[PDB]
Enzyme design. Structure first.
Site, PDB file in Angstrom:
ATOM      1  N   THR A   1      -3.473   8.371  -3.078  1.00  0.00           N
ATOM      2  CA  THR A   1      -2.259   9.043  -2.628  1.00  0.00           C
ATOM      3  C   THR A   1      -1.061   8.679  -3.495  1.00  0.00           C
ATOM      4  O   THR A   1      -0.227   9.542  -3.792  1.00  0.00           O
ATOM      5  CB  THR A   1      -1.983   8.695  -1.165  1.00  0.00           C
ATOM      6  OG1 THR A   1      -3.088   9.117  -0.357  1.00  0.00           O
ATOM      7  CG2 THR A   1      -0.721   9.388  -0.677  1.00  0.00           C
ATOM      8  N   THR A   2      -0.961   7.416  -3.916  1.00  0.00           N
ATOM      9  CA  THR A   2       0.150   7.005  -4.768  1.00  0.00           C
ATOM     10  C   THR A   2       0.095   7.702  -6.122  1.00  0.00           C
ATOM     11  O   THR A   2       1.133   8.091  -6.671  1.00  0.00           O
ATOM     12  CB  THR A   2       0.141   5.486  -4.944  1.00  0.00           C
ATOM     13  OG1 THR A   2       0.257   4.856  -3.664  1.00  0.00           O
ATOM     14  CG2 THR A   2       1.300   5.042  -5.823  1.00  0.00           C
TER      15      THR A   2
ATOM     16  N   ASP B   1       0.832  -1.196   0.000  1.00  0.00           N
ATOM     17  CA  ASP B   1       0.000   0.000   0.000  1.00  0.00           C
ATOM     18  C   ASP B   1       0.870   1.250   0.000  1.00  0.00           C
ATOM     19  O   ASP B   1       1.715   1.432   0.880  1.00  0.00           O
ATOM     20  CB  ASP B   1      -0.928  -0.001   1.212  1.00  0.00           C
ATOM     21  CG  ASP B   1      -1.836   1.212   1.249  1.00  0.00           C
ATOM     22  OD1 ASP B   1      -2.710   1.328   0.365  1.00  0.00           O
ATOM     23  OD2 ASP B   1      -1.676   2.047   2.163  1.00  0.00           O
TER      24      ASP B   1
ATOM     25  N   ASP C   1     -14.486  -7.901   0.196  1.00  0.00           N
ATOM     26  CA  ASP C   1     -13.853  -6.967  -0.728  1.00  0.00           C
ATOM     27  C   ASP C   1     -14.781  -6.649  -1.894  1.00  0.00           C
ATOM     28  O   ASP C   1     -14.713  -5.562  -2.479  1.00  0.00           O
ATOM     29  CB  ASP C   1     -12.528  -7.539  -1.231  1.00  0.00           C
ATOM     30  CG  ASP C   1     -11.470  -7.595  -0.147  1.00  0.00           C
ATOM     31  OD1 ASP C   1     -11.644  -6.924   0.892  1.00  0.00           O
ATOM     32  OD2 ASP C   1     -10.463  -8.311  -0.334  1.00  0.00           O
TER      33      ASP C   1
END
Lengths: 499, 523, 512
Positions: A86-87, A53, A360
Site C-alpha cells: 500500500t505504501t 506501518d 517472522d
C-alpha cells in the site's frame, strides 16, 4: 455568475491536486522499507500512536481534501485484494502526478498524457511476466535458506544462520497439503514453537510431530504409546449425602465406557478426577488433564478426533525427556501438516527473541512458497522497467513519447526511497542499478549481471536470486495497475464546484 | 531609561557584556574571514569574482588578491591579515594556511570558554603544543632535494606549488619556470625573486610562452636599428613633442609664412637635441610617452635605437638595474645619469618582436619569463602562480627538507600531539587536544572542495596512520573518496613553509584572545 | 498543527532537555528546593522530582513521554527516577552529530545500542556480592533512604520491618524468586501509639468494622470459612427488582426469602466456625443468623485477600455456601482479635505460619506521623526487594558512572568508522551525575571533575567517588553509598531506550 457556493477552475486546480497528493505521499515516504523510521499519530483526545506501518498510518491519518480521499479509498482496494504494498502505491501515484503536471505546462493535453500511462502500464506487465520465475528450488537448491537467514540477521539469533535456517526450510516443506486441484498454500497457523533451557542455542532439535506441554500425573501410565486411537474430551470427569455418593458412582460408568473404546492417548480440557486417573494405571492408558483449548484444537485437526467418531488416528506417541518439563511427542497422525520446534538455550531472553525472529522467518519462506510465481524485489523491478519503457517510447510517437518517458522515470522513486532510508547515497545506488540492467538489454551475455537488487544493509547492489529476497507477482502487478488508475482519476478533474 | 546600556563608559563605543561574550564576537569576525578563503584552498578551490576599485571585473582564486581588494575594517580581523603579510616574508606560500588554521583555533576555543575554562590557561595550552609540533615536524620529513640543478628534478617538485593556483597547466609551467631558476642557481646565496620577472603579451594561449635571458620588454623596437652594443642608455619620461621653454619663451605668429619658419626652426632644434644624444656617446634612447614622427627619423639617421615604455613600472625597472634615471626636461645632454648595459638587440619570439637587454660580458642573474595569453585577466592569474612558484625555490636555497602534502602531515602531526595531551595531567590538556583538532580542518577543506564527504576522509586517514603507513594524504578525485600515497604521486610541501606558517598562525590566534574589549580614542 | 523535517528531531531535543533542566538540582542529599505557584496563589516547596513534574503542564508530546516513562519507573523501583531523566536528557543534549554533522539517525541509534551492551558488562565487573544472612550489612544499605528523615531514631526498627516482610513474600522454589509488594505485603495504618510500637504482623489483617455486638472477641483456635457468593435471596438471571403490590403475595415472597437465607446459613454453622468471610456484601437478614451463632461477620474481601487466608489458617475457597465441606477450617490460626485498637475495628487472623504474605502494622501518634512513616517504609521494602533479587552492589556517589565512562573511552580506540564519534559521546554524557553532586555542594566543578578522571585511570575504578555532603573525593569502601545493581541496570536501559525512541520520530502528525 451568482451561485449558491464557491467555484474555482483552471490549471491551479491541477496544481492544488498534485500538491495535495504529494503531501500525503511524503508522510509515508520515509516509513517505506523495514528500516523505516517510526512516526507519531496525535488523536483528538491527545493519545499518541507510534507505528512505522504505512497501511496502518493511512487508516488513522485524517486529512480533508477531495483528491486525498481518493488515495485513501484506493488503500482499501490494495489491502482487500492483496494486503501488502500500500505504501508503494501511494508513492508511485504521487510521482505520476508531479511529472504529469510539468507536462501540462509544456502544452500537452491531459488526454494524451492519460493515453500514455495506459499503454505504458500494459507493456510493463508483459515485460514483468517474461522476467518472472515459477515456484521451484525448494529441495536440492538454495532459494529458501538464504531467504530466512537475511530476515533473522537483525536479532541475536543471527549468530549461526545456517543451522537455524535448515530447521525452518525443512518444517515449511512438510506442512504442504494440496487438497484442492494442486493449489497448496500454507496455513496461517504454523509450527508450534516451544522453549527450554538447553545450556546453549546449538542444542535445539527439530521434531517431526507436534509437542504438547503437560504432564501425565501418576507415573503408572506408560510413556510409550504405539496405539493409534486418540480421544478428545472437552467434558471434565471431575465434579446432599446421596448427591456426593451417586456422582462418584456415575463416574464409574464414565471411565468404563471410555476405556471400552480402546483409546490409549486421551486428552481432557476441564481435567480428570483423581480417582479416574487411578483407573488408567491398570489399563495402561495414557491420560492427560488440563490441556489447553487452543493446543488441543490443533491436535483434533491432526489426529482427526471429533471435538467410531471421537477416536483419532496415529502411529507412535512417546513422552520425551526435556529440561524443566516433559513434552509429549505425537508422530504420524492421519492428516496434520504441522510440527513442533523445541528452542533450547541459556535463558528466557534468548528463547523469546528467537521465537519472534523464527516466526517472522517462517512467514518469509511461507509467502514465497504460497504465491505461484515470485519476482526479484529490492527495486530490481522498477530499475528494469526504467530502461525498457524508455526505449519503447521512441517507437510509438503521436505525442505519447513524453507521457511514456515520464512513466519510466517516475518508477525510479522506489529504489530512490529505499536508498535514503538505508543511510546511503541515493544518486549512486540508483545509477549503479540502471547501469547493470542496461547491459542486460544490450546483449544476452553472462558477463552482464542480471536481476540485480539493492541491499539495504551493505548498501551495495546484490543478486536477489542468491540473497533470497522475493516478493509475489501479484504485488507488483496490482500495484502498477492501481497506481495508474489513481493518477488518471485525479488528472481528469479540471474544475472544482463547491456548494 | 534605566537600566541602560552596560559596560560602555567611553565614546559610545559598542561593548559586549559577560552574557554577550565580547571575546566570542571577536571570534565571529575572524570566522567569517576564514569562510571567504576556505573554499579557495586546494587545486579544486572555487574561483571568486572580484570587482576592482576601478570597477574592473576580475576572476581569480588567489588569496592575496582577495584580501587586498576586500577591505577589512574589523581591528581583530586585521591581526590575521597582518599575519598573512608576515607569511609572505621568508616564504611565498602558506597564505590559506594562516587564514584557515588560525580561524580553526579561535573556533574551537569557543567550546573551551563555554565550559568556564579561563582564557589565561587556554593561552598556555596553545603555546606548549606549538613547541611540541616544532619538535615532531623534523621527524616527518620524507625526502629532500639533491640540489643537482637538474631540470627534471626542479620541474618535479614545482608541480605542487603550481597547483591550487593554475590547474591542468602545471606541466608547462613547471618546465618553463625551472629553466629560468636553474640558470641563477650557479650563483650562490644571491638568488632572489627580483631576478626572475614576468612579461605578458597578448597571444593564442599559454602553450606559446617561452623563456628569454635578460630583461625583455613586450614593446618592439620602434627604430630601425636591429642591435647596438652601446653601454650608454638615455632614459627620459618626457615624450617627444613640441618643445617648451622653462623661461617666458613667448611666440607671436601673425602671417602664414611665420608658421613654416618657426616649424623649420623647431625641426632644426630637435636635430641638435638628437645630435646631443649622439654627442654624449648614447646610442640608446628611451621615451615614456608618445614619440613624434619627425624625431623618429633622426634616431635612424644617427642609428640611435628608440625605446618606448608606456608603463611606469617598466621605467623604474631599469632605474634599479642599469642605473639610468629619467629627467623632466626633454633630452638634456646629461651623460652622468645614463645607464650601462653590455648588449642590446631585438628578437622575435612567438611571432612578436621584443626588446631584450642582455649582458654578454657579465654573466648576470637576470632572466625573464615571457607569457602568452588571449585575456589580460588570464595572464595576470598565471603571473600569480609564477611568483608563488619562484618563491618556493628561494626557500630551497636554505636547508632542503620536504614534507608530503594533501593533508598527510596534518593528520600525522595531529595524531602525535593528541597522544601527548592524553598523558599530560592538569587543565592544559584541553587546549592541547583542541590544538590537534585544528589540524583536521585542512583535510576537511580539501574534501569539501572536491565534493567528497569530510567525515569519510578523516576516518580513513586515521586507519592508515594507525597501522604504521605514513606519507598517506588525500587523493583528489570527484568519484573517489579513497586515499593514495603522496610519495608515489610526487606531491611534496616545503619544510620552512610549514614551519613559519604554524608559528605565525599561533601568535595570531593568541593575540586575539588577549584582547577582551575594543575601545575608541582620539589624539 | 504539525511539524515535519529536521525540526521534529531538533524539537524533541529541546522538549526533553527543558524537562531535564528543572530536576538537575534535585539530585543528591544537598539538592536544592523548588517553588510551584498554584492557580489560587498557593506555594508548594517540595523538592521531590516526582511531585514537581506531576503538577507541571507540558504542551509538547515528547515531554509527556518523558513523564509517563518516569511514572512507570516509580512502580518498579522507588529510587533513581531523577537520574533516569537527567541521563535521558544528557544523551540527547548533544545535537552536533544529530544535525550539524548531517548524520543519519540509524547510524547514531546503532551507536547507542552498541554502547548499551558495554555499559551493562562494565557494571558486573566492578560489582561486589552481598551476604543476605547478615542483617547488619542490610542496615547500611537501607539507610540510604532513611537518612535526612525523621525515622532516623527508629531507623534500627525500620530495617527489621522491611527486611522480614520481603523475606516472607519471596518464593524461591519457582526459580524466578518473584516478589509482589502490592498484594502479599499489603500495609494498613493503626491510629494511636508511637513509632516504636510499630511491628510486623504475621498474617492478613482485615479492616472490616464490627456491625453487631455479638462476635468472638478472643479465640485460641480460630475457624475461618472462605466463600465467594453473597448471602441473599436467590434472584433471577437479570437485575430486575421484585415488585409486589398484594399482601397475600408478600407472605409468599417473604417466606422464600427467609427460607433460602436460613438454609445457606445453616450449612455454614454446621462446622461451627468462628467467622464468616464473604467476597460480596451481606444483607441484614443474613446478619441476624450470624449474630445468633455468636460469630464475626466479615464481607467485602477481594480474591487476592482470600487466597492468602486459605494458605494461612488452612481454609478452602468454595463457590456456594451449600457446597462447604469439612476441608475448609481455620485450624492452626494463632488468635482471633476483633478488639478495637486506636478507635478503629481490626481483625487479627494471625498465626505461627508463613502463607507467603504478611501485614505491616503502622503505629503512630497522629495521622501526620503515620503518613511520614508509611512512605518511608514503602521504598525501604523496595530496596529489600531489589537486593534479594540481585545481591550485588555497585559504588555510588558518581563512582559507577565514571567507572563505565573510562571503559567506553578505552574501547573506542579499537573502533574504526564514523560510529566512534557518537560512541564516545555516551562516555561524556555519564559525567552529568557526578557533576550535579559537586554543583549542589558549591565546590568548583571543573577542578574536581578533572582530577576525578585521573583517579579511575590509575587507581581502581571500584572506589574514588564523589562525597555529596563534604564535596571532596572519598572511596566508596569507607562510605555507605553502595547501591543495588538492579537499580542501575534498569536506569541505563531506560535512559538509552527513551533516547532512542525520541530519535526515531521524524514527523508529528495529528489525526484519528
Amino acid at each position: 455568475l451568482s451561485v449558491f457556493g464557491d467555484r474555482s477552475t483552471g490549471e491551479t486546480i491541477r496544481s492544488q491536486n498534485v500538491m495535495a497528493a504529494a503531501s500525503i505521499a511524503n508522510i509515508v515516504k520515509s516509513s517505506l522499507g523495514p528500516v523505516g523510521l517510526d512516526k507519531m499519530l496525535v488523536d483528538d483526545i491527545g493519545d499518541v500512536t507510534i507505528t512505522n506501518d504505512g497501511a496502518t498510518i493511512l487508516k488513522l491519518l485524517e486529512v480533508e481534501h477531495p483528491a486525498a480521499k481518493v488515495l485513501c479509498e484506493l488503500a482499501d482496494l490494495q489491502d482487500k485484494e492483496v494486503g501488502d504494498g500500500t505504501t508503494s502505491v501511494v508513492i508511485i501515484a504521487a510521482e505520476l502526478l508531479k511529472n504529469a503536471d510539468e507536462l501540462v505546462k509544456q502544452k500537452i493535453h491531459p488526454t494524451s498524457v492519460i493515453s500514455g500511462y495506459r499503454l505504458a502500464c500494459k507493456e510493463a506487465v508483459r515485460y514483468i511476466n517474461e522476467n518472472l520465475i515459477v515456484n521451484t528450488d525448494e529441495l536440492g537448491r538454495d532459494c529458501l535458506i538464504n531467504a530466512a537467514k537475511t530476515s533473522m540477521s537483525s536479532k541475536i539469533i543471527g549468530i549461526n544462520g545456517d543451522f537455524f535456517a535448515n530447521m525452518v526450510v525443512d518444517a515449511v516443506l512438510a506442512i504442504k497439503y494440496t487438497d484442492i486441484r494442486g493449489q497448496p498454500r500454507y496455513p496461517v497457523n504454523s509450527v508450534n514453537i516451544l522453549k527450554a533451557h538447553g545450556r546453549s542455542q546449538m542444542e535445539s532439535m527439530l521434531i517431526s510431530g507436534y509437542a504438547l506441554n503437560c504432564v501425565v500425573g501418576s507415573q503408572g501410565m506408560p510413556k510409550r504409546i504405539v496405539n493409534a486411537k486418540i480421544a478428545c474430551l472437552d467434558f471434565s470427569l471431575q465434579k446432599l449425602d446421596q448427591i456426593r455418593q451417586r456422582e462418584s458412582d456415575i463416574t464409574k460408568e464414565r471411565i468404563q465406557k471410555i476405556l471400552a473404546t480402546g483409546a490409549n492417548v486421551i486428552l481432557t480440557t476441564g481435567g480428570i478426577d483423581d480417582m479416574c486417573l487411578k483407573y488408567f494405571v491398570e489399563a495402561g492408558a495414557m491420560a492427560v488433564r488440563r490441556v489447553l483449548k487452543r493446543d488441543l484444537k490443533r491436535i483434533a485437526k491432526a489426529s482427526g478426533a471429533t471435538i467410531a467418531a471421537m477416536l483419532g488416528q496415529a502411529e507412535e506417541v512417546v513422552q520425551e525427556r526435556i529440561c524443566d518439563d516433559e513434552l509429549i511427542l505425537i508422530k504420524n497422525t492421519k492428516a496434520r501438516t504441522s510440527a513442533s520446534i523445541i528452542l533450547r538455550g541459556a535463558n528466557d531472553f534468548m528463547c523469546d527473541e528467537m521465537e519472534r525472529s523464527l516466526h517472522d522467518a517462517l512467514c518469509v519462506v511461507k509467502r514465497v512458497l504460497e504465491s505461484k510465481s515470485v519476482v526479484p524485489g529490492g527495486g530490481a523491478v522498477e530499475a528494469a522497467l526504467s530502461i525498457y519503457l524508455e526505449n519503447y517510447a521512441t517507437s510509438m510517437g503521436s505525442r505519447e513519447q513524453l507521457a511514456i518517458a515520464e512513466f519510466a522515470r517516475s518508477l525510479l522513486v522506489i529504489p530512490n526511497t529505499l536508498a535514503v532510508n538505508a543511510a546511503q547515497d541515493s544518486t549512486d545506488l540508483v545509477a549503479k542499478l540502471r547501469a547493470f540492467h542496461n547491459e542486460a538489454q544490450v546483449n544476452p551475455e553472462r558477463k552482464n549481471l542480471k536481476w540485480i537488487g539493492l541491499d539495504l544493509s551493505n548498501g551495495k547492489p546484490r543478486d536477489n536470486k542468491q540473497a533470497g529476497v522475493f516478493e509475489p507477482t501479484i504485488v507488483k502487478v496490482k500495484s502498477l495497475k492501481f497506481a495508474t488508475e489513481a493518477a488518471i482519476t485525479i488528472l481528469r478533474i479540471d474544475d472544482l464546484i463547491k456548494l | 531609561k534605566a537600566p541602560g546600556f552596560a559596560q560602555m563608559l567611553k565614546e559610545g563605543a559598542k561593548h559586549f557584556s559577560g552574557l554577550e561574550e565580547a571575546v566570542y564576537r571577536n571570534i565571529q569576525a575572524c570566522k567569517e574571514l576564514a569562510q571567504t578563503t576556505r573554499t579557495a584552498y586546494g587545486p579544486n578551490g572555487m574561483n571568486k569574482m572580484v570587482i576592482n576599485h576601478l570597477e574592473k571585473l576580475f576572476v581569480t582564486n588567489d588569496a592575496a588578491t582577495i584580501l587586498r581588494e576586500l577591505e577589512v575594517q574589523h581591528p581583530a580581523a586585521k591581526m590575521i591579515v597582518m599575519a598573512s603579510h608576515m607569511q609572505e616574508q621568508e616564504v611565498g606560500d602558506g597564505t590559506n594556511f594562516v587564514l584557515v588554521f588560525a580561524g580553526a583555533l579561535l573556533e574551537l576555543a569557543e567550546e573551551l570558554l563555554r565550559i568556564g575554562l579561563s582564557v589565561s590557561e587556554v593561552i598556555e595550552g596553545y603555546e606548549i603544543a606549538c613547541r611540541k609540533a616544532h619538535e615532531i615536524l623534523p621527524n616527518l620529513v620524507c625526502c629532500s632535494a639533491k640540489n643537482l640543478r637538474d631540470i627534471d628534478e626542479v620541474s618535479s617538485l614545482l608541480r605542487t606549488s603550481i597547483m591550487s593556483k593554475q590547474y591542468g597547466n602545471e606541466v608547462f609551467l613547471a618546465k618553463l619556470i625551472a629553466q629560468a631558476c636553474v640558470s641563477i642557481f650557479p650563483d650562490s646565496g644571491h638568488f632572489n625573486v627580483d631576478n626572475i620577472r614576468v612579461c605578458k603579451i597578448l597571444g593564442s594561449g599559454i602553450s606559446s610562452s617561452s623563456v628569454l635571458h635578460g630583461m625583455v620588454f613586450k614593446k618592439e623596437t620602434e627604430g630601425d636599428v636591429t642591435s647596438v652594443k652601446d653601454a650608454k642608455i638615455a632614459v627620459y619620461s618626457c615624450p617627444f613633442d613640441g618643445m617648451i621653454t622653462e623661461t617666458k619663451g613667448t611666440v607671436l605668429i601673425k602671417t602664414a609664412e611665420e608658421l613654416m619658419n618657426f616649424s623649420k626652426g623647431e625641426e632644426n632644434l630637435m636635430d641638435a637635441q638628437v645630435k646631443a644624444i649622439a654627442d654624449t656617446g648614447a646610442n640608446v634612447v628611451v621615451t615614456g610617452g608618445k614619440v613624434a614622427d619627425m624625431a623618429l627619423h633622426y634616431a635612424n639617421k644617427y642609428n640611435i635605437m628608440l625605446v618606448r615604455l608606456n608603463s611606469k613600472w617598466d621605467l623604474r625597472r631599469l632605474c634599479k638595474t642599469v642605473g639610468a634615471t629619467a629627467l623632466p626636461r626633454l633630452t638634456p645632454p646629461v651623460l652622468e645619469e645614463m645607464g650601462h648595459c653590455d648588449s642590446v638587440y631585438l628578437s622575435e619570439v612567438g611571432d612578436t618582436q621584443v626588446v631584450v637587454f642582455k649582458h654578454e660580458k657579465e654573466d648576470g642573474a637576470i632572466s625573464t619569463i615571457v607569457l602568452r595569453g588571449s585575456t589580460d585577466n588570464l595572464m595576470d592569474d598565471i603571473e600569480r602562480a609564477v611568483d608563488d612558484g619562484v618563491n618556493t625555490f628561494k626557500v630551497l636555497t636554505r636547508d632542503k627538507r620536504l614534507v608530503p602534502g594533501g593533508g598527510a602531515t596534518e593528520i600525522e602531526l595531529a595524531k602525535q600531539i593528541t597522544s601527548y595531551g592524553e598523558t599530560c595531567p592538569g587543565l592544559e590538556q584541553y587546549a592541547i587536544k583542541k590544538f590537534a583538532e585544528a589540524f583536521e580542518a585542512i583535510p576537511r577543506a580539501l574534501a569539501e572542495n572536491s565534493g567528497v564527504k569530510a567525515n569519510e576522509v578523516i576516518s580513513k586517514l586515521y586507519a592508515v596512520h594507525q597501522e604504521g603507513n605514513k606519507n598517506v594524504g588525500l587523493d583528489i578525485e570527484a568519484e573517489v573518496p579513497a586515499v593514495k600515497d603522496m610519495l608515489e604521486a610526487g606531491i611534496l610541501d616545503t619544510y620552512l613553509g610549514k614551519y613559519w606558517a604554524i608559528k605565525l598562525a599561533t601568535n595570531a590566534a593568541v593575540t586575539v584572545l588577549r584582547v577582551d574589549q575594543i575601545i575608541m580614542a582620539k589624539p | 498543527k504539525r511539524e515535519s523535517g529536521r525540526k521534529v528531531q531538533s524539537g524533541n531535543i529541546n522538549a526533553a532537555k527543558t524537562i531535564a533542566d528543572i530536576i538537575r538540582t534535585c539530585l543528591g542529599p544537598k539538592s536544592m528546593m523548588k517553588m510551584l505557584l498554584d492557580p489560587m496563589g498557593g506555594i508548594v516547596m517540595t523538592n521531590d522530582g516526582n511531585a514537581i513534574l506531576r503538577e507541571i503542564q507540558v504542551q509538547h508530546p515528547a515531554a509527556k513521554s518523558m513523564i509517563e516513562i518516569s511514572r512507570t519507573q516509580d512502580e518498579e523501583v522507588g529510587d533513581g527516577t531523577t537520574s533516569v531523566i537527567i541521563l535521558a536528557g544528557e544523551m540527547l543534549s548533544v545535537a552536533e552529530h544529530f544535525l550539524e554533522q548531517q548524520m543519519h539517525p540509524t547510524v547514531v541509534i546503532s551507536a547507542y545500542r552498541k554502547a548499551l551492551d558495554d555499559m551493562i558488562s562494565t557494571l558486573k565487573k566492578i560489582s561486589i556480592p552481598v551476604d543476605i544472612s547478615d542483617s547488619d550489612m542490610m542496615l547500611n544499605i537501607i539507610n540510604s533512604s532513611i537518612t535526612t528523615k525523621a525515622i532516623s531514631r527508629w531507623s534500627s526498627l525500620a530495617c527489621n520491618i522491611a527486611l522480614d516482610a520481603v523475606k516472607m513474600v519471596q518464593f524461591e522454589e519457582n526459580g524466578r524468586k518473584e516478589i509482589d509488594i502490592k498484594k502479599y505485603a499489603r500495609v494498613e495504618k493503626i491510629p494511636g501509639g508511637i513509632i516504636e510500637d510499630s511491628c510486623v504482623l504475621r498474617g492478613v489483617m482485615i479492616n472490616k468494622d464490627v456491625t453487631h455486638p455479638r462476635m468472638r472477641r478472643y479465640i485460641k483456635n480460630p475457624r475461618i470459612v472462605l466463600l465467594d457468593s453473597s448471602l441473599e435471596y436467590k434472584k433471577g438471571e437479570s437485575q430486575t427488582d421484585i415488585e409486589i403490590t398484594r399482601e397475600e403475595d408478600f407472605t409468599r415472597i417473604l417466606q422464600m426469602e427467609e427460607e433460602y437465607i436460613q438454609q445457606l446459613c445453616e450449612d455454614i454453622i454446621q462446622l461451627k466456625p468462628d467467622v464468616v468471610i464473604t467476597e460480596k456484601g451481606i444483607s441484614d437478614l443474613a446478619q441476624h443468623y450470624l449474630m445468633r451463632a455468636n460469630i464475626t461477620a466479615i464481607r467485602r474481601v477481594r480474591k487476592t485477600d482470600n487466597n492468602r487466608i486459605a494458605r494461612a489458617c488452612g481454609a478452602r475457597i468454595v463457590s456456594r455456601p451449600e457446597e462447604l465441606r469439612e476441608d475448609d477450617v481455620g485450624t492452626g490460626a494463632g488468635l482471633l482479635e476483633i478488639k478495637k485498637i486506636g478507635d478503629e475495628y481490626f481483625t487479627f487472623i494471625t498465626d505461627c505460619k508463613d502463607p507467603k504474605a504478611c501485614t505491616i502494622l503502622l503505629r503512630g501518634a497522629s495521622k501526620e506521623i503515620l503518613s511520614e512513616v508509611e512512605r518511608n517504609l514503602q521504598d525501604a521494602m523496595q530496596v529489600c526487594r531489589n537486593v534479594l533479587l540481585d545481591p550485588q552492589l555497585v559504588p555510588g556517589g558518581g563512582a559507577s558512572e565514571m567507572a563505565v565512562a573510562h571503559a567506553l573511552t578505552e574501547k573506542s580506540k579499537a573502533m574504526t568508522g564514523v560510529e566512534q564519534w557518537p560512541y564516545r559521546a555516551v562516555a561524556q554524557a555519564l559525567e552529568v551525575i557526578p557533576r550535579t553532586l559537586i554543583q549542589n555542594c558549591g565546590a568548583s566543578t571543573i577542578r574536581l571533575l578533572t582530577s576525578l578522571r585521573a583517579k579511575h585511570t590509575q587507581e581502581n575504578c571500584e572506589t574514588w567517588g564523589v562525597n555529596g555532603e563534604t564535596g571532596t573525593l572519598v572511596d566508596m569502601k569507607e562510605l555507605g553509598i553502595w547501591e543495588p545493581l538492579a537499580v542501575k541496570l534498569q536506569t541505563y536501559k531506560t535512559a538509552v531506550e527513551t533516547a532512542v525512541l525520541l530519535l526515531r520520530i521524524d514527523d508529528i502528525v495529528s489525526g484519528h
